[PDB]
Amino acid sequence: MKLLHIDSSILGDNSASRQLSREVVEAWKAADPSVEVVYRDLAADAIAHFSAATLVAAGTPEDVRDAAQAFEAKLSAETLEEFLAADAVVIGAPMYNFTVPTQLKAWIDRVAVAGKTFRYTEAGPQGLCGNKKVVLVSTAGGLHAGQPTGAGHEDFLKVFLGFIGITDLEIVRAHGLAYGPEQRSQAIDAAQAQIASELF
Template sequence: MKLLHIDSSILGDNSASRQLSRSVVDAWQVAEPAVQVTYRDLAADALSHFSAATLVAAGTPDELRDAAQQHEAKLSADTLQEFLDADAVVIAAPMYNFSVPTQLKAWIDRIAVAGKTFRYTEAGPEGLCGGKKVVIVSTSGGLHAGQPTGVGHEEFLKVFLAFIGITDVEIVRAHGLAYGDDMRTKAMSDAQAQISEQFAAA
């Protein structure tokens, strides 16, 4: 099985989402020793944002692309293929200003490709990525799950994943991390316990 591990926090070693996403991957590897892990750090190796240059590169025949267009087209193709090859994805998604990090949104824009991850039919859109499992590691300083303030975070990710056909989605959540040491410790401990329980039952 191929597992794609995505980190997006800009906080480095101080990141709660990085710590928890690593715990998920480590537990997965213990449960399934044969799993092959591909790691992408969207903060350390950020993708350029979806732009007119992206569209121009995609619409230009390969033999006519200049160096910048070749780079842009390869970036899109490699990012998409990495996702398509994965059987499962662990997405570390801290909340920044009521949404996901801009680095994670840039990755989403690279994998949302008509004809590859979704298509439009006479009956409406159809996701083409069914069968993949996704674990979202959701972290935030406040308490937003189930609240209007969470719509651009967890809910956005679930809507996008459903759009491309992924319905096997699990959330590991640690919220309230800015509400003092006790709250942070409990939130992280509860999330770690959920991870352990999830893979013990696997």
């Protein structure tokens, strides 16, 4: 199986989602020694904003593209192909200003591709990624899951993942991390117990 491990935190060694996403992957490798892991750090190697230039490049034949358009088209193709090849995806998803990092949304914009990860039908849109397993690693300073404040974060992610057809989704959450050291530690400990005894 191919597992794509994505991180999007900008907090480096202080990141809760980087710690828990690595822990999920390590547990996964221990459960399935044959898994092949591909890593993509969307904060360290940020994907360009999906732009007018991205669209023009996609509509320009390869042999006619200039260097900037070749970069956009290759970025689009490599990101999409890596996701299409993955059978499982572990996604580190901080909440920054009430939604996911732009580094993560910029990746979503390269993997939401008509004819590839969903299709338009005469009957409506349909997701094409039903075979892929996703583990979302959801981290936030506050506790706002299931409340309106959470809309841009987990609720959005569930919308997007549902649209491209993900049915097998697990959420490893550590929230309330900004409320103090004890609260942060317990939320991480609870997430670790989930990883240890509820994921595999």
